[PDB]
C-alpha cells in the first residue's frame with residue numbers, strides 16, 4: 001500500500017502511478033474523477049474478475065493484459081466468460097486437456113472453453129433445461145474457433161463412433177462453401193449458424209442439426225480489394241487433378257471475371273492441400289465421388305456464368321452475345337440447351353396480364369440476370385450440402401431428451417462500403433447484445449422480485465430498444481426493413497427514393513444520421529452498439545426482391561442432370577419478370593424464440609488488434625469492446641446481486657455433510673432444513689437471501705461451500 005492508483009494513459013490505455021491539492025491530485029511514474037483504485041498484487045491474473053475488490057475499467061484491462069501475454073486467453077467475468085484472440089496456435093486444446101476438464105466445476109479448474117461446455121452440459125442434466133452457448137464479438141474475434149472447440153469437447157465427453165467422426169467434419173465442409181477471406185478475417189464466416197447437439201435421457205450424443213441463416217451469396221460474383229470469394233473456388237482451381245480438371249472445364253485464376261482480384265493467398269493454408277481435406281471431409285459425411293463431382297460442376301458453372309460477355313449494339317437497345325463459349329460451358333455443366341438459354345436470357349417471355357410476350361433485354365439487364373442466376377445457383381448448392389450434412393448427423397432413431405445449442409453468427413463489421421448484407425449482419429449482433437443485456441440485468445433482477453427477496457432495481461444504462469425499433473419495428477412508425485419492403489412494391493421506385501423516404505420517416509430518430517449533401521441520397525448512417533456505420537443503399541431494392549429469369553429457372557428445373565434438377569426443384573417462391581428482409585425477420589424471430597426456451601451461457605470474444613498479429617493488445621480497441629459488450633456492468637450485477645441460485649432440496653442434499661447434526665431425523669420442510677443448516681454453518685446474513693423456492697448466494701460463496709464439501713472424505 002504505497003498510494004498506487006491507475007492514471008489514464010495514451011500509449012497503453014492505463015498506467016499505474018503513486019498530494020491532494022483541492023479538486024486535483026499529483027501522480028509520478030490529473031483530475032479527481034480521472035483516477036481509479038488499483039487492486040493489491042494478490043489479484044494478479046485472477047481467474048474471475050468478480051473477486052476483484054476494486055471493479056473499474058483499468059483493473060479489468062490490466063488483468064486481461066497480464067493473462068494474455070502469459071498464454072492465458074480465457075478469463076471469467078462473473079457468470080459469463082471473456083476470451084482474447086491469441087492469433088497463435090497455443091497447446092491448450094489437446095485430448096489430455098479434454099480429459100482434465102471432464103466433469104470438473106468452474107472453480108476446480110482454470111478458465112477455459114472446455115469448462116464452459118462442461119458446466120452447461122451438467123446444468124442440462126441436473127436442471128433438465130436446454131442449454132445454449134452464445135459467442136459474441138466483432139469479425140475475427142474467435143467465435144467460430146470457440147464454437148468448434150465446444151463440439152470437439154462434447155463429442156469426446158458425451159459418447160459411449162461414426163457420429164463423432166461426421167460431427168467433427170461438419171464445420172470443415174460448411175467453411176469450404178460458406179467462409180471467405182475478408183479484410184477483417186481470413187476465414188470469415190459469411191453465414192450464421194446454430195448447431196443443435198441432441199442428447200438422450202442418460203446424456204450421450206445421439207444426433208445433431210445445423211440451422212444456417214442468410215448466405216452472403218453476392219460474394220460469389222464480386223469481391224472488394226484484398227478479399228477472396230468462397231474458399232471452395234480456390235480449393236477446386238488449385239487442387240483438382242488432371243482428369244477432374246477436364247470434367248469441370250477449369251482454367252487459371254486470371255481467367256474468371258467473378259474472381260475480381262485473381263489469386264489472393266491465405267498465409268495459414270495452401271488451397272491445393274485444403275481441397276484434399278475438403279474431399280476427405282465430404283467422403284466421411286457420406287458424399288460419394290459422383291456427388292462430389294456434381295457439387296464441383298455447379299461451383300464451376302457459377303464461375304463460367306461470370307465469363308458470359310454481352311455487347312450493347314448500336315442502332316438498337318437489344319443486347320447481343322457474340323462469343324457463346326462461356327454459355328456453352330454453362331449449359332454443358334448445368335445440363336440445359338444452349339439455344340434455349342441464349343433466347344431466354346436475351347429475349348424472355350413475360351406475363352403481361354393472362355398471356356406472355358417476348359420482351360427485349362439491354363446489356364445491363366442481361367448482365368444483371370446472369371449475375372442473379374449465379375448467386376441463386378450457389379445459394380441452392382449451399383442449401384443442398386447443408387440438407388445432406390443434417391441428414392447424416394440427425395440419422396439416429398434414439399429418443400432425444402435435451403439439447404445444447406451453440407450460436408455462431410457473422411460478427412460486427414465496418415468495410416469501406418457497407419451494403420444490405422452488412423446491415424443485417426450488424427443488426428443480428430445488436431439483437432445478440434440486447435439478449436445479453438436482457439439476460440444479465442432485466443431477467444436477473446426480475447428473478448429477485450419473483451422470489452420475494454429485498455432488492456432495489458439498479459438501472460445499468462444498457463438498452464438498445466431505439467436501434468431495434470429503428471430497424472425491426474413493422475408499424476407505428478415503420479422501421480428501415482419495413483420501409484424497404486414498402487418501396488419495393490412501388491412501380492417507379494429507385495434506391496435514391498428509398499433513402500429519401502428513410503430521411504423523412506426516421507430522420508429525427510436518435511440512432512439514424514441523414515447523409516451530408518455531398519452524397520446524393522446514396523448513403524445513410526446507423527448508430528449501432530459497437531459504432532456508427534455508413535450504409536450505401538445501392539442495389540437494395542433488387543437485393544430485397546431477388547428477381548430471377550423464370551425462363552432460365554424453368555430450363556434448370558427440367559435439366560437433364562439430376563443433381564441440377566434437384567437444386568432447382570422448388571421454383572414456386574421465385575419472384576421475377578417474400579422479400580429477403582421478410583425472410584431475415586422470420587429467421588431472426590425463430591432463433592430468438594428458440595433461445596428464450598434455453599439457459600444461455602455468453603462467451604465474449606475480444607479481438608486484440610486489427611492487424612491479425614500475436615503478442616499485440618491495442619488497449620483502446622479492447623476498452624471500446626468491453627464498453628459496447630457491457631463487460632464491466634455484467635461483472636457489477638454479479639458483485640452487487642446474487643448470481644448463484646439453488647433450490648432447498650439440492651442445498652440440503654449437497655451440503656448436509658457440512659452440518660450433519662443440524663437437521664433432526666424424519667420429515668422436515670426444505671426451507672426450514674436449510675435455515676437450520678445455515679445457523680449451524682454460521683454464515684454472514686449479507687452473503688445469502690432465502691426466497692420462496694430457492695436460496696440466493698453472493699459470488700464465490702457457493703464455490704467455497706463446494707471446496708469445503710471436498711474436505712469431507
Ligand SMILES: Nc1ncnc2c1ncn2[C@@H]1O[C@H](COP(=O)(O)OP(=O)(O)O)[C@@H](O)[C@H]1O
Pocket residue numbers: 085086087088089090137138139140141142143144145146185186187188189411605
Ligand atoms: N482460440 C484461438 N486459438 C488460435 N487461433 C485463434 C483462436 N481464435 C481465433 N484464432 C485465429 O483468428 C482467426 C479468426 O477467428 P474466427 O473464430 O474465425 O473468428 P470469428 O469471430 O469471425 O468467427 C482464426 O481463423 C484463427 O486464425
Ligand SMILES: COc1cc(N2CC[C@@]3(O)C(=O)c4cc(C)c(C)cc4N=C23)ccn1
Pocket residue numbers: 189190191192193212213214215216217408409410411420421422424425428580581584585587588591
Ligand atoms: C440481407 O441479409 C443478408 C445477411 C447475410 N448474413 C451473412 C451472415 C448471416 O447468415 C448471419 O450471421 C445471420 C444470422 C442470423 C441469426 C440471421 C437471422 C441472419 C443472418 N444474416 C447473415 C447474408 C446476406 N444477406
Ligand code: VO4
Pocket residue numbers: 137138139140141143144184185187188189190409410411412
Ligand atoms: O469473421 V466472422 O466469422 O465473425 O464473420
Ligand SMILES: [Cl-]
Pocket residue numbers: 079080081600601602
Ligand atoms: Cl452467462
Ligand SMILES: [Mg+2]
Pocket residue numbers: 143144145187188189409410
Ligand atoms: Mg466465424
